[PDB]
Amino acid sequence: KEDFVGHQVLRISVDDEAQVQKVKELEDLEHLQLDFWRGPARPGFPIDVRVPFPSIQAVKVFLEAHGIRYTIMIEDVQLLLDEEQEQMFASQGRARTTSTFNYATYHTLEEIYDFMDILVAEHPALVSKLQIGRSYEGRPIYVLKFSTGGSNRPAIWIDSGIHSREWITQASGVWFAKKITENYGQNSSFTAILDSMDIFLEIVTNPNGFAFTHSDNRLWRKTRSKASGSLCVGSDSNRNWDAGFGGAGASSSPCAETYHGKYPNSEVEVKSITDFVKNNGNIKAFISIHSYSQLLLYPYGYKTQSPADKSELNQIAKSAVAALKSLYGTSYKYGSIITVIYQASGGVIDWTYNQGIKYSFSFELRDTGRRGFLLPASQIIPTAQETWLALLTIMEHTLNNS
Numbered sequence: 001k002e003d004f005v006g007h008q009v010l011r012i013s014v015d016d017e018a019q020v021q022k023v024k025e026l027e028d029l030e031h032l033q034l035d036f037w038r039g040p041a042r043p044g045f046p047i048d049v050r051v052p053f054p055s056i057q058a059v060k061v062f063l064e065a066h067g068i069r070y071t072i073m074i075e076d077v078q079l080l081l082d083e084e085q086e087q088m089f090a091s092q093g094r095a096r097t098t099s100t101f102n103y104a105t106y107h108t109l110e111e112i113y114d115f116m117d118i119l120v121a122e123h124p125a126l127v128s129k130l131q132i133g134r135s136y137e138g139r140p141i142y143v144l145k146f147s148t149g150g151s152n153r154p155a156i157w158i159d160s161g162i163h164s165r166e167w168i169t170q171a172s173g174v175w176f177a178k179k180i181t182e183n184y185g186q187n188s189s190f191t192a193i194l195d196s197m198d199i200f201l202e203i204v205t206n207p208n209g210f211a212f213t214h215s216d217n218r219l220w221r222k223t224r225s226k227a228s229g230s231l232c233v234g235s236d237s238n239r240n241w242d243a244g245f246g247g248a249g250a251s252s253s254p255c256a257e258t259y260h261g262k263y264p265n266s267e268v269e270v271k272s273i274t275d276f277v278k279n280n281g282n283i284k285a286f287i288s289i290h291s292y293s294q295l296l297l298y299p300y301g302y303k304t305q306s307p308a309d310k311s312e313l314n315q316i317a318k319s320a321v322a323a324l325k326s327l328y329g330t331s332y333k334y335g336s337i338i339t340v341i342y343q344a345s346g347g348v349i350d351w352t353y354n355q356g357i358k359y360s361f362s363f364e365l366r367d368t369g370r371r372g373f374l375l376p377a378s379q380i381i382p383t384a385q386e387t388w389l390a391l392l393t394i395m396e397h398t399l400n401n402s
């Protein structure tokens with residue numbers, strides 16, 4: 001285990017471009033071992049960073065010397081860890097059925113893989129468990145297929161957990177998979193979707209990573225491929241695609257949290273998807289799910305030039321986000337990745353959209369920074385529930401607009 005005792009997470013404000021440029025100088029001070037939750041982009045866009053205990057003075061002094069304002073969002077990250085660990089301990093249950101699974105606690109890799117096998121066994125005629133590959137540490141990579149028949153019917157892909165530290169995404173992916181086998185046949189509207197389409201749902205899209213955030217390092221985001229030449233492990237799975245690969249927004253340093261890999265599709269966990277998509281070919285909408293920041297995003301990340309379907313994408317996004325907000329009030333923003341979060345090269349949806357999958361969306365779930373990746377387990381179900389309203393609006397649109 002790594003501990004995060006007295007590590008703080010700072011929210012840095014930048015009022016102009018010169019300040020934005022200073023924060024990305026600090027980002028270049030490798031030996032600070034700074035973990036940027038939400039990196040430098042533009043003035044008025046919030047920069048979140050986790051700084052390790054030793055580095056805190058160095059960061060604070062640099063910031064004040066330049067008159068850049070910061071605030072402390074989380075005064076000690078290890079306390080949030082202790083709270084999480086504490087409630088998984090108390091929630092440690094025994095799911096032999098999906099109706100008795102605890103959806104309101106975080107689970108381990110095994111417990112989720114167990115869940116998939118209990119789900120396909122309870123509803124064999126709807127869900128299937130497809131293995132599309134094996135990760136670097138040899139773990140199988142699974143996809144659930146939800147289908148009422150057909151041969152190569154138009155499908156809808158959802159993935160979750162491409163970045164392992166984002167535990168709200170794998171947890172919501174598990175709630176959705178119960179949800180579909182619940183509302184099929186009982187929800188007139190949702191029943192019409194599955195009568196026409198297939199849904200592919202990949203819950204643990206980065207299994208080696210996910211297990212590592214339970215074993216050794218909670219705050220781990222990359223894969224676990226061990227690379228030629230370094231003490232340094234992993235590549236950022238959402239910098240590894242061949243869309244703007246190696247462009248601005250991805251690091252060439254293997255020790256960086258945003259290191260792209262040696263070549264596009266070098267990671268098994270990504271190349272499995274690329275082969276799945278390129279062999280399926282009738283995938284109509286592609287949704288990749290992250291956290292945090294409460295954003296719904298569409299192409300592009302790597303480039304300022306607009307996607308050709310911009311007006312439509314912006315309207316779906318407008319409708320979806322409004323459906324999400326109608327439940328719990330949770331405020332989202334939307335728009336193209338590069339304008340709404342930052343420029344970042346080699347993303348999933350920039351690739352899929354360039355493969356003709358027009359309805360390519362990326363979510364960033366709750367929250368907007370007070371817990372970040374350590375989102376309280378009591379929010380797992382509200383988060384899944386409201387994002388299902390948005391995920392439905394996109395599915396309905398796919399159905400309608402053939």
Ligand SMILES: CC(C)[C@H](N)C(=O)O
Pocket residue numbers: 238239290297301337341343344347362364
């Ligand atoms: C680029 C963006 C789509 C994503 N949150 C990333 O940082 O990997």
Ligand SMILES: [Zn+2]
Pocket residue numbers: 162163166289290291
């Ligand atoms: Zn992510």
